[PDB]
Amino acid sequence: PQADYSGEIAELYDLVHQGKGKDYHREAADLAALVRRHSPKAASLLDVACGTGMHLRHLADSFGTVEGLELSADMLAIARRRNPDAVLHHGDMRDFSLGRRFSAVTCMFSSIGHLAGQAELDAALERFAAHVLPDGVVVVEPWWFPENFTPGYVAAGTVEAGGTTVTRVSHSSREGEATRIEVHYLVAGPDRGITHHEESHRITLFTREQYERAFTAAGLSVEFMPGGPSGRGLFTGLPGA
Amino acid sequence: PQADYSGEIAELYDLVHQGKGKDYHREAADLAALVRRHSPKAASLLDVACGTGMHLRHLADSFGTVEGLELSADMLAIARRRNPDAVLHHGDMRDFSLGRRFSAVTCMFSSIGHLAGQAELDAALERFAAHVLPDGVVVVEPWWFPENFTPGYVAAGTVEAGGTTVTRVSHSSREGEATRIEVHYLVAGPDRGITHHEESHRITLFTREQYERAFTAAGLSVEFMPGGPSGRGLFTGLPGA
Ligand SMILES: Cc1cn([C@H]2C[C@H](O)[C@@H](COP(=O)(O)OP(=O)(O)O[C@H]3O[C@H](C)[C@@H](O)[C@H](N)[C@H]3O)O2)c(=O)[nH]c1=O
Ligand SMILES: Cc1cn([C@H]2C[C@H](O)[C@@H](COP(=O)(O)OP(=O)(O)O[C@H]3O[C@H](C)[C@@H](O)[C@H](N)[C@H]3O)O2)c(=O)[nH]c1=O
Ligand SMILES: Nc1ncnc2c1ncn2[C@@H]1O[C@H](CSCC[C@H](N)C(=O)O)[C@@H](O)[C@H]1O
């Protein structure tokens, strides 16, 4: 079933990622510091595929003006409630045009893997370049590479919130040039009983040199740092190559 | 869903109840001690609704001859493999006839709740009495009574065993004079990927006087003891009444 971050799946996103130990406060701090390394004076940040706008809520404490772009209306609805004073655009990272430039353009937690093929990767990175200030920095957190992805990987966790128990379990396979991650949820609580939910995605296993080539074609210089927020590293790009 | 202890549900049974902390070793030892209290020289035991035969496997070390009865073929299959040298019958606790009598007749973990109302309860207790020796004892672990059931109860647990992860979540409500328990599972492993299973059962909340009535109509004296292996207590009955 779903591949579009919507309905109950969208409502469950923050809770399950908090449950899994994702620390958006620490990630934002680190992002902020990294942005300031490359661009001492940095003042504004666009978060592209900002999802439920968690990083944006914390980055607003480091940057004077933040903005987001998100494809999923249901994710976007959450992020707007969380960030009621920022402008958050409903739109596609492949094609957007905001009429303005930012000190940082960020794209976090491997949202970039929802792109297929070099053409789409090149297009996004070109849009990212089209929205970054001449002394700013673009930051893209890749998906795993084909060489380091671990097929067969199972994640399972349970979290409780407000009397509701939520169990999420994922299985990931190598399905050609993408990971297939299939994720099932069981939600249960005394009054609502039990419901079952599912999502399934192809997340593209772009090689390191594929991302590098996307940055380059977009006029950015590209550097890679191993590790990073989720283990997959981080690319940063500076205009002027 | 399913109400019939079959297929992968039967295959997951031992694993999920082990994960919940069910200790058939201790339960069997306590049961043997209780049988010996009422029938010091008890030597044989029929476990009715023996399921996958866990109690029977431990009760073998206490009684010279153990035997089982079980309605679900798939549960029975597993119990026979576990208890290769005992006779395990395929049939129905409401209407069975094995041609012999045992020092103890047991019916454990609220399998009695799978009967629909007083007439079926009466008939099973009369079959229990027909298969007990004159100086033996019938043991029935009841379902919850209506006064001690908690509607809205949620159980949720995840266990991993041999490459596989298994999450089981249950939710219970009051439906007439029974509990509706709905149980969802997620099973995931590296090679097999992820599947969702479900069962639903209607387990009758017979009152204490209902059970007592059934023992008495079967010719058995009855005593209830609170607590028990599962918190639901334990009835024992002795022929001769
Ligand atoms: C720990 C580890 C994981 N993996 C892969 C296995 C699997 O595809 C993924 C972790 O699965 P998960 O924890 O269920 O996924 P995660 O929370 O990272 O979320 C990922 O998938 C969801 C669907 C997207 O919305 C999200 N943006 C992705 O990060 O990373 C590896 O390749 N190597 C690893 O060491
Ligand atoms: C601990 C406790 C449990 N309950 C009821 C709530 C729910 O109906 C049940 C526990 O749910 P569970 O732990 O998922 O069920 P359990 O492992 O005991 O298994 C029960 O249901 C399954 C379907 C049967 O095969 C089994 N023979 C039954 O014991 O017992 C209560 O009413 N009060 C309680 O304090
Ligand atoms: N073409 C596209 N344009 C914009 N957003 C996209 C997209 N394809 C997928 N997405 C969004 O990518 C995000 C993946 S989840 C990551 C969410 C957020 N960046 C965080 O760190 O939590 C989802 O919100 C999804 O809706």
Ligand SMILES: Nc1ncnc2c1ncn2[C@@H]1O[C@H](CSCC[C@H](N)C(=O)O)[C@@H](O)[C@H]1O
């Ligand atoms: N009418 C009937 N006759 C015999 N067994 C029955 C039955 N109705 C349900 N059952 C069985 O009762 C069992 C409930 S689960 C309990 C199994 C076992 N006594 C244990 O302690 O683990 C299941 O095996 C189910 O198949």
